[PDB]
């Protein structure tokens, strides 16, 4: 099975590519609770069809570029910018924490 996941599109900014943020959950190997972690997949949108805020299924594919091994499968939810604004908030928090 080509692995297929779900995320939300946090980056408009490339040509025929979309940054898709994908959360995942799992129990903690020692302390036992559920922890939530996430990573950004760089996905192939040849049509420039998927836009920001789109929650999309994403798929294991033939390599496109460096960093692009995944292409966009379909659109599931449209326009959750609550997710995007959450992630953007984090990225703005980055500007603290330094020197």
């Amino acid at each position: 099975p080509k692995k297929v996941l779900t995320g939300v599109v946090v980056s408009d900014k490339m040509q025929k590519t979309v940054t898709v943020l994908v959360e995942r959950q799992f129990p903690h190997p020692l302390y036992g609770k559920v922890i939530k972690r996430s990573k950004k997949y760089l996905a192939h949108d040849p049509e420039e069809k998927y836009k920001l805020g789109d929650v999309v299924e994403i798929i294991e594919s033939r390599p496109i570029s460096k960093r692009k091994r995944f292409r966009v499968l379909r659109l599931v939810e449209s326009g959750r910018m609550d997710l995007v604004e959450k992630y953007l908030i984090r990225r703005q928090n980055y500007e603290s924490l330094s020197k």
Partner: protein
């Protein structure tokens, strides 16, 4: 700590520092005597304890104890360092193994002979 706190910070495994750099992780180091002298012990006792400054194969200079009654060591004799320290002495971290190299064993000792490095005498 909350569990979430443990998931964040975790618990710190704590390391122990080696009571002995004979380096190498080695059980013994060979060395040469530098100074072979006597020293007075810490506050609760009195005696003259016999020690050598040793320059190790391992690059270190260390003071080693010379156990037992008699001893033959002098400025140039080469010796074996076995480690384990002397409590009522200042900075003596290792013992000299007797019987090895220029260390002789302890003459006439009948009792715990392998400590002190003396052979089993014959009988009549």
């Amino acid at each position: 700590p909350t569990i979430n706190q443990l998931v964040r910070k975790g618990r710190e495994k704590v390391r122990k520092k080696s009571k002995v750099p004979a380096l190498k992780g080695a059980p013994f180091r060979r060395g040469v005597c530098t100074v072979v002298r006597t020293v007075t012990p810490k506050k609760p006792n009195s005696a003259l304890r016999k020690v050598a400054k040793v320059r190790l194969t391992s690059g270190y200079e260390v003071t080693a104890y010379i156990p037992g009654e008699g001893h033959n060591l002098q400025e140039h004799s080469v010796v074996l360092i076995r480690g384990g320290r002397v409590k009522d002495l200042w900075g003596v971290r290792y013992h000299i193994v007797r019987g090895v190299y220029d260390a002789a064993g302890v003459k006439d000792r009948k009792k715990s002979r392998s400590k002190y490095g003396t052979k089993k005498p014959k009988e009549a």
